[PDB]
Design a protein around this ligand. Structure first.
Ligand SMILES: Nc1nc2c(ncn2[C@@H]2O[C@H](COP(=O)(O)OP(=O)(O)O)[C@@H](O)[C@H]2O)c(=O)[nH]1
Length: 165
């Protein structure tokens, strides 16, 4: 089995913890906001993976980008909320500072718009975030931390993008 380490980046309250618990624990529960690493076995294309999932502390436009992430990470999930215009604007900034940090080592990157279950609360269309991912040449998905199958699909997509390198 292979070992891979995945950093989950994003603004606060966009659902980094909830997506990662929905994937690791199989369930949607609460009870962090402080960085935490989760382990998880998964098979992608018949290949077994040991995953260290780093759910980061949550970054704003000003919070410095930590180098530690760059040093050992194999893929980055950038999550925003489809109910928060601020988190979408923040993920653009996060992306530039992460490219500023690894330089241009063509590292697996993926954009996720979370909370797609909140139909009445949506302010960002699917197409708006899909255009953003394509201008980055990154994979795009909309997820809901209430729906296990969209959580699982985010995490096996970032490993798919990692095998391609
Ligand atoms: N309805 C809905 N609520 C969510 C979703 N993801 C997170 N939440 C809620 O939004 C808040 C987000 O908190 P959290 O998951 O810790 O986000 P984090 O700060 O980025 O780690 C919590 O109250 C969650 O219950 C989702 O997909 N759908």
């Amino acid at each position: 089995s292979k070992s891979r380490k995945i950093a989950i980046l994003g603004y606060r309250s966009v659902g980094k913890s909830s997506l990662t618990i929905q994937f690791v624990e199989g369930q949607f529960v609460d009870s962090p906001t402080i960085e935490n690493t989760f382990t998880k076995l998964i098979t992608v294309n018949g290949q077994e993976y040991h995953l260290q999932l780093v759910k980061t502390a949550g970054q704003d436009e000003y919070s410095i980008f930590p180098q530690t992430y760059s040093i050992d990470i194999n893929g980055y999930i950038l999550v925003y909320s489809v109910t928060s215009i601020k988190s979408f604007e923040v993920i653009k900034v996060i992306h530039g500072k992460l490219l500023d940090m690894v330089g241009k080592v063509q590292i697996p990157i993926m954009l996720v718009g979370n909370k797609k279950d909140l139909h009445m609360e949506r302010v960002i269309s699917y197409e708006e975030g899909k255009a953003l991912a394509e201008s980055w040449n990154a994979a795009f998905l909309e997820s809901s931390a209430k729906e296990n199958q969209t959580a699982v699909d985010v995490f096996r997509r970032i490993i798919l993008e990692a095998e391609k390198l």
